[PDB]
# Entry
Amino acid sequence: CQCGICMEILVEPVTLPCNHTLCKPCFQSTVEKASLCCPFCRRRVSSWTRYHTRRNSLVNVELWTIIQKGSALKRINKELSDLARDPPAQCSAGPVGDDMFHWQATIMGPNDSPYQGGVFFLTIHFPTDYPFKPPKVAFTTRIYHPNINSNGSIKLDILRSQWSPALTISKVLLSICSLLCDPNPDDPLVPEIARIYKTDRDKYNRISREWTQKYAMGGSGSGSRKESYSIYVYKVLKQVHPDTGISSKAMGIMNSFVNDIFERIAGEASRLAHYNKRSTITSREIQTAVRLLLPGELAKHAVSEGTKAVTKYTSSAKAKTRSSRAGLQFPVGRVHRLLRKGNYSERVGAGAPVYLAAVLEYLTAEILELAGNAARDNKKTRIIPRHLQLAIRNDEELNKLLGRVTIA
Ligand SMILES: [Cl-]
Ligand SMILES: [Cl-]
Ligand SMILES: [Cl-]
Ligand SMILES: [Cl-]
Ligand SMILES: [Zn+2]
Ligand SMILES: [Zn+2]
# Structure
């Protein structure tokens, strides 16, 4: 509600001849140091800046006195917070897993439009220089529109020529909504559709509804809260070392292992789905993710445990709990939500969370078995962080996998 560059309150505001205002830090960071141009409208402010920097009159005293009453990453987080503060109508967006520069977004077909009742998924990629460079926004759901083509590119002025740091991803999503309601056939991306819209509006409305029906019939994101698997880590420990406990500090490290493995597998599985233009993540993407990221025998065993859980899940009775159907301690239904919540794909198949849950359980068991062994070497009955560090370092494959995870 004040500074357009950093979306924070204005401090020592500087107003340029063009009357765009930014806080003194932002002004110094982007104008004074190099560009000497307004970041919003690119008006040259060199003569003005040199004069007033020498005379210490840059700051707008009147505005400043009466107000009392990296940068790219920081701002993206401010957008997401802003997005939660004022959820845009008919829209949602959030990061893909833990990648803040790669978001998923959903748009519900406006009531006014012929897309009503459909859900359209979009991909958003933030550049390194954001907010000074535009975000890359594209549809992954087919849609019949003059300004949207089969590649999912969107011809919208604010996405390219008219992009400004003052704009936000919420405003961008609202503008796309308006574009769905009111196309611009005069400057089209697809001429045939634009010609049809101009001459046969009834046909345009008809084809839009049929496409919406055929192809169109994505959230706050993974969130800031750290998930815990204490319940299921404990169950596995009782199976692997019934007479060995685990300290709560060690349990927090186990959560860090599980969450790290979850994010990496799903993230890669997300990469594969997008790479092959697949709407749904299935056990296949999870398996190829596992095979590429896990080393050696860990990968061979993880693939075995995942294939066996999926096989047992399909043949089992549909009445029992999903985790029970797969013979797993780790929660299948919960892993499924975390795959949808993380915005890795439009859809998530039912075998995917089973396979991933089984891979997580297997790796947890491996780590717990070795940590317990490492505890029994020091004549101890309870796993502490040090025994987790030992179990990782003393196993070449596990150290390749989890060595980068910090252990205190
Ligand atoms: Cl100038
Ligand atoms: Cl594009
Ligand atoms: Cl599946
Ligand atoms: Cl990796
Ligand atoms: Zn600022
Ligand atoms: Zn300006």
In short: The domain at 230-402 is CATH 1.10.20.10 (Histone, subunit A). Residues 264, 293 surround chloride ion (ligand 4) (CB under 6 Å). The two ends are 41 Å apart (CA to CA).
